[PDB]
């Protein structure tokens, strides 16, 4: 679905800044809490999701693995 | 780490859902440092003396915000997922 | 709006909700000049948005943006 | 200072056709300073030694950014605007 990496992570970049412009919507309407099926749709549940799966999609094309900077983040935190 | 996991140990740690503005504006923050980051092109997993301002440190700073604001908004960030594989199946 | 906080707050959201549909804009490609059939969803539209909310942030946080260029005009004379 | 001229001193100094992300990181990148700006509270209009990581500054920053990229993309900001004040009058 994408060969040459750059135009991969320019897109998911793109993507990103606009699910956390849907998530400010969201947040400003105040459509917080727990949604079922029916109410997922514009919810702050479904863009933070949203948000979340272009973070990992980012951390996938440029060679990042997530839980290996969590731990790192950890050995930080509680040198901090 | 399970995401629900990682949620669980964010709110353990951070939880102030009485200054919900504070963690938007702090994922604004970081996704303009992730900006930054990925224009200087600081791709790969990093050791820990190259941490700094890598891809990978705002990535998972990114991370952190967007699982403490599913805390804050009574969000269950697995749960929503799960609903998410149901819709995108459609 | 009365309370400052919330006026600002409210541009704040704005302002994150325009460069997402700028984002948008700009990765479909849709730039140009457009005529007001084709303004809606243009990169010219939410740039000027985008535009809009700074100038309405500027007003709630006391910002002369005219002052503000006029210092960075100088500064960047020293660069 | 004109938004039109304002945009057309930017070009004069900053006009790179080919690297339209550049200016797009940018623009992000300071939304993110705009946010700390914010965040801390630092508002009003400073003079030159309370400059740096204003409020003041960051708007001007995004601003400056929302110019480059209309320079970038053949947008004309004050027409633009034009436009759009002719429908928020209609409805
Ligand atoms: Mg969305
Ligand atoms: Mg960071
Ligand atoms: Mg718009
Ligand atoms: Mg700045």
Same mark, same amino acid.
């Given at each position: 679905?994408?060969?040459?990496?750059?135009?991969?992570?320019? *897109?998911?970049?793109?993507?990103?800044?606009?699910?956390?412009?849907?998530?400010?919507?969201?947040?400003?309407?105040?459509?917080?809490?727990?949604? /079922?099926?029916?109410?997922?749709?514009?919810?702050?549940?479904?863009?933070?999701?949203?948000?979340?799966?272009?973070?990992?999609?980012?951390?996938?094309?440029?060679?990042?693995?997530?839980?290996? /900077? *969590?731990?790192?983040?950890?050995?930080?935190?509680?040198?901090?």
């Amino acid at each position: 679905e994408f060969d040459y990496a750059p135009e991969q992570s320019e *897109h998911y970049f793109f993507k990103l800044i606009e699910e956390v412009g849907e998530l400010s919507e969201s947040i400003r309407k105040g459509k917080s809490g727990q949604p /079922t099926l029916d109410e997922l749709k514009g919810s702050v549940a479904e863009e933070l999701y949203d948000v979340l799966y272009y973070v990992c999609a980012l951390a996938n094309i440029h060679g990042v693995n997530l839980e290996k /900077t *969590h731990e790192l983040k950890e050995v930080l935190n509680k040198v901090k």
